[PDB]
Amino acid sequence: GSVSKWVRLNVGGTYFLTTRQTLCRDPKSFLYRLCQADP
């Protein structure tokens, strides 16, 4: 990733707080790409 295990993502203005492992459970997803940094 690019930040501590926990993350916050602003879905439609609503901040969801969750660990990346809940997101990284399926490696194929928009959320997975969101976790790791890239240009």
């Binding site: 194929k28 790409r33 890239d38």
Partner: protein
């Protein structure tokens, strides 16, 4: 050709791979739907087939790569140093 043809070729391959991974990040959805909807080659495979045909199968770069790889391997056998990383990178490239 005087700046390690292999070095630049490997750099260009690596940049293509990185850019194509990023592109894959972009258009996952069509890769997942259009490919089997229209029953065609998957788009990631498309983006390596096109690179292979345009860089490797393309004659001039192909034969320069062939001759210069022969040069590096012969010179390594003689006992002089060659950029083994570049040769290794070509090896996989070709796989």
């Amino acid at each position: 050709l005087n700046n390690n043809f292999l070095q630049t070729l490997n750099q260009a391959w690596n940049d293509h791979q990185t850019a194509m991974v990023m592109i894959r990040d972009i258009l996952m959805y069509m890769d997942r739907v259009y490919v089997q909807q229209n029953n065609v080659e998957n788009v990631y495979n498309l983006g390596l087939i096109i690179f292979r045909d345009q860089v490797v199968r393309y004659g001039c770069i192909r034969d320069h790569l062939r001759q210069t790889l022969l040069d590096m391997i012969a010179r390594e056998r003689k006992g002089e140093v060659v950029d083994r990383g570049a040769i290794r990178n070509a090896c996989q490239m070709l796989m």
